[PDB]
């Protein structure tokens, strides 16, 4: 399903690990992935307790409400590649207007922000639209260590228990006006399916 | 003062701006390095304990040694303007060569990276040299809240005590090659002088 | 309202004075400001010709050369409500879809005569898929600073408006190498008497 | 002789008219020319009466300094009608500095010590052989100057041109655009050339 406010569209979002064993051998494992192409609503009060309290509530009140989405991820943490490994995030956005955007990714543990990454991006005019590409943004050591700790657990239900109190809040703003363009609240479980990583998108509402 | 063999820092300023009325604006500078006398050297091992294990030591070992500097700031946190206030950072760099730079600003508390902001800038030919201007980059909420918390302390010595374990590491790289162009370690105290904000620059060396 | 020809868009225009209160505190006063599209009212260019008598490089001559889409009239109600060391400046920004080197000529006319001309050349910068031209903090010439001071010393705002009837500014932006007219703005002035401060009104210049 | 302060050097200065009678015919007449190559001193108080006084004047600029930036140029302009005048009247000049900076060249034209017209041109440097060079190429003269040259040329005798020129002066002030620091100041005074060798000039260092 499509994640788009009236000002910005999320085209793609992937978090992955890449291994280049040698100059001729390359492997990539996707942890989570929202690829390029009806939404169910979720009351934002149902998730407030798990997010910062410039928190999710203040951001929602500031608006616009059409910019708010919840994504449930079932992350693939299976050791499918022999891990020099690179851990990264790639994402792509588009707008109708020519503007610089700022993508804030806040990582929270028990509702409290522990690390934050802020990336500004300039648009490329492409096919009449303005496209923003954040390509292979390295994951911070906190996240790489967190993934390694999860993978050392012997049971997927233990990974789910740890993940119950782990959340990510992505806030995209227009750099110069500081207007909220898109807000995505990410929640996680580990995937147990043969099809791998899965996701479900919901529109965040209030009343 | 601050220049490696590949990149020169022309200006750096952090400030708050208030709109008093539709035609009147006030600006308060917290810190400012404006636009050559010799620099005193500081052994980089004297500051590693506050910048421990992309860290300062790892970057310094990778080199070049001429790219590393330490700036001590005495920040002006006096309420000189009645604060909708904008908190921002403006900076300018220059080089003899045309390249795309990536500016990473890492905010650390007790030696741990809590926020990282990354901004990419494209060279502009100006007066026979290449200039990079990052104008009015908004401060993240973590920094605005940190400034507000410091200002609520009743004594300036308490602010200095909190600031003992707060550091900022700015790393400028050539975007495509990832070569280190300039690294600045920033450390802070609150200014108690009538002259306002002050700074002192040192060259980082390893005896 | 938006000032844009088919080749160049005016994003911002501000004239201001800046004062340093202490080493870390600066105050800025805007005299006039056009900040960052609703439709524009049209004004026949013959209704303003009598106030721009200057012939060579003047309004009528440029309008006749064209293109008509490049011509605008801005009415300003300037806010004239310091110490030594005050900075008087002008900041402006433009954008285009194409990469150009532009030349910005600002002609100041007083009592029907061109008294000052300031010329600035600007090189396109690729930003967000468009080309931006920024003329940041261009210092006002002493003639303009002294003119502002003389207006402020007048005891009545109607005397300021009478002196201002004879004062016009013509801004002509051209493509540097071809000398093609990209944008022409005729600026006319009054002093603001409102509590809201500086005001402006944009009109498109037409002929019949 | 060399016109250079510790921050800026004047390489060349020429005022001229060009006539392109047809696609194959070109003519150029130089009115004045300082081409690329000790100085006699003149006390700046000897010329104060002929230049702008009080605010932004020669005296105020001289007192602000640096004293090494101030020069007086006497010109004997060639006003002979040597070409059949569509003609273009222009000024071309070049400067150089050791530093990378944007300069602003103000040319004030004065009659009886009062500024009548001013042209301000900003220029960006080009890095050339380890020097930053500024070129103002074929800057069009304003109509005031073209009409003044035509009026002088209408006088039947050269002494009559010298009489009118007695109270005509040009003050060129070059500043660093962003800091407004004075880089170079040249006071120009004029007579008409009566020699077969044409246009002449003499450079003096202004002292106090
Ligand atoms: C306090 N409110 C909530 O816990 C909550 C309320 N309503 C939701 O959605 C409604 C639309 O269905 C949520 F998603 C969450 C939520 C939130 Cl806020 C969270 F931070 C983590 C988290 C969940 C659910 C869960 C998960 C399930 C599937 C995939 C990913 C995570 C579950 C929790 C048990 C183990 N796993 O982990
Ligand atoms: C353990 N080593 C250090 O602490 C250190 C060593 N040598 C330096 O420089 C050498 C040139 O002399 C430093 F700067 C620092 C340092 C560092 Cl690493 C830091 F993280 C914060 C910090 C300081 C100094 C200080 C400050 C004083 C004035 C202005 C700004 C900051 C002082 C600390 C007490 C309260 N304030 O805050
Ligand atoms: C001969 N034609 C004109 O005078 C004219 C005609 N039509 C206009 O607009 C049509 C859309 O409205 C104009 F603007 C002007 C004009 C022009 Cl050309 C000018 F050089 C100055 C000037 C004015 C009007 C004025 C002013 C008012 C408000 C703000 C600024 C200036 C008025 C004049 C009395 C005091 N103030 O000063
Ligand atoms: C009041 N002080 C002066 O008049 C003065 C004093 N001392 C000078 O020089 C010292 C080094 O000799 C001057 F140059 C000038 C001066 C100045 Cl300020 C001026 F505005 C015009 C002007 C002159 C001289 C003159 C001229 C002669 C030759 C060439 C160009 C001009 C002469 C005057 C009669 C006709 N022509 O026209
Ligand atoms: C540090 O700066 C981290 C930047 C944000 C990384 C987001 C990647 C999260 C998706 C991976 C899913 C792993 C299961 C928790
Ligand atoms: C209008 O903007 C004029 C700009 C300055 C023109 C300077 C040329 C003066 C030299 C010509 C000598 C003619 C004798 C008076």
Author numbering:
A (entry chain B): 218 to 254, 262 to 277, 280 to 309, 312 to 435
B (entry chain D): 219 to 253, 260 to 277, 280 to 309, 312 to 435
C (entry chain C): 218 to 253, 260 to 304, 309 to 435
D (entry chain A): 218 to 254, 262 to 309, 312 to 434
What do the authors of the reporting publication say about this deposited model?
IAG933 sits in a hydrophobic region created by the side chains of residues V266, I271, l296, F275, T395, F416 and V415 but also shares a salt bridge with E417, hydrogen bonds with K274, K298 and Q270 and a face-to-edge aromatic interaction with W300. This Ω-loop binding region is known to be conserved across the four human TEAD paralogs, and YAP or TAZ binds to all four with similar affinities. Consistent with this, surface plasmon resonance showed comparable binding of IAG933-related YTPs across all four paralogs. Unlike the LP-binding compounds, these molecules directly prevent complex formation between YAP/TAZ and TEADs by competition at the binding site. This variant was resistant to growth inhibition by IAG933, YTP-17 and YTP-75, whereas wild-type SF-268 cells remained sensitive, confirming the exquisite on-target selectivity of IAG933 and IAG933 analogs.
The four highly conserved paralogs of the TEA/ATSS domain transcription factor (TEAD1–TEAD4) are the most distal effectors of the Hippo signaling pathway that regulate cell growth, tissue homeostasis and embryonic development. TEAD transcriptional activity is dependent on protein–protein interactions (PPIs) with cofactors, of which yes-associated protein (YAP) and its paralog transcriptional coactivator with PDZ-binding motif (WWTR1/TAZ) are the two most important coactivators, and vestigial-like family member 4 (VGLL4) is a prominent co-repressor. The YAP–TEAD protein–protein interaction mediates YAP oncogenic functions downstream of the Hippo pathway. The YAP/TAZ–TEAD complex has recently become a druggable oncology target, with the first inhibitors being a variety of allosteric binders of the TEAD lipid pocket (LP), whose binding prevents post-translational autopalmitoylation of a conserved internal cysteine that is essential for TEAD maturation and function.
